[PDB]
Design a protein around this ligand. Structure first.
Ligand SMILES: COc1ccc2[nH]cc(CCNC(C)=O)c2c1
Ligand SMILES: COc1ccc2[nH]cc(CCNC(C)=O)c2c1
Ligand code: NA
Length: 155
């Protein structure tokens, strides 16, 4: 099956500066800002499409990682697309999960962060609702931590 999900986040922060933190300078900023993420590193590639990044994080007290493959990166248009290509544990019935993200101008010089998630499953399997809830919350917390960090570090 094929399933879509969307979420949106608002910030008082300007979109180009949020995108620099989230994407350009992600390998430095994300582990500083996000207290459950230990590291974000390039496993292979030059930063462009095809690049594989490894995000190491703690969950339930246990060290885990996930691998992200960069699918599109467009700084001019504040766009970044990636799919999950590996990690700890099993996908179970999840064949594929990709993300499409964009930042746009929001209220009073601020931003809106838009994320579209596309999940492909085996046959008639449905995406797990408890894991969806957890993912949704993680996304919220992630975007919020980045905002906190940038605010606490004017520039
Ligand atoms: C969670 O909210 C958003 C919103 C707009 C976004 N743009 C770019 C990213 C970063 C995507 N990097 C990772 C490791 O997921 C993003 C996140
Ligand atoms: C609360 O922040 C966290 C904590 C652990 C994590 N592992 C992986 C991600 C990336 C999350 N990116 C998006 C677009 O949802 C992550 C975020
Ligand atoms: Na961290």
């Amino acid at each position: 099956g094929v399933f879509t999900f969307q979420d949106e986040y608002t910030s008082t922060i300007a979109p180009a500066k949020l995108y620099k933190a989230l994407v350009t300078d992600a390998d430095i900023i994300i582990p500083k800002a996000v207290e459950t993420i230990q590291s974000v590193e390039i496993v292979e590639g030059n930063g462009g499409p095809g690049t594989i990044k490894k995000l190491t994080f703690i969950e339930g007290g246990e060290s885990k990682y996930v691998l992200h493959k960069i699918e599109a990166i467009d700084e001019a248009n504040l766009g970044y697309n990636y799919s999950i290509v590996g990690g700890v544990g099993l996908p179970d019935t999840i064949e594929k999960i990709s993300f499409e993200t964009k930042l746009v101008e929001g209220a009073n010089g601020g931003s809106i962060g838009k994320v579209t998630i596309k999940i492909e499953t085996k046959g008639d399997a449905q995406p797990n609702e408890e894991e969806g809830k957890a993912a949704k919350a993680r996304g919220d917390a992630f975007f919020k931590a980045i905002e906190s960090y940038l605010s606490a570090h004017p520039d």
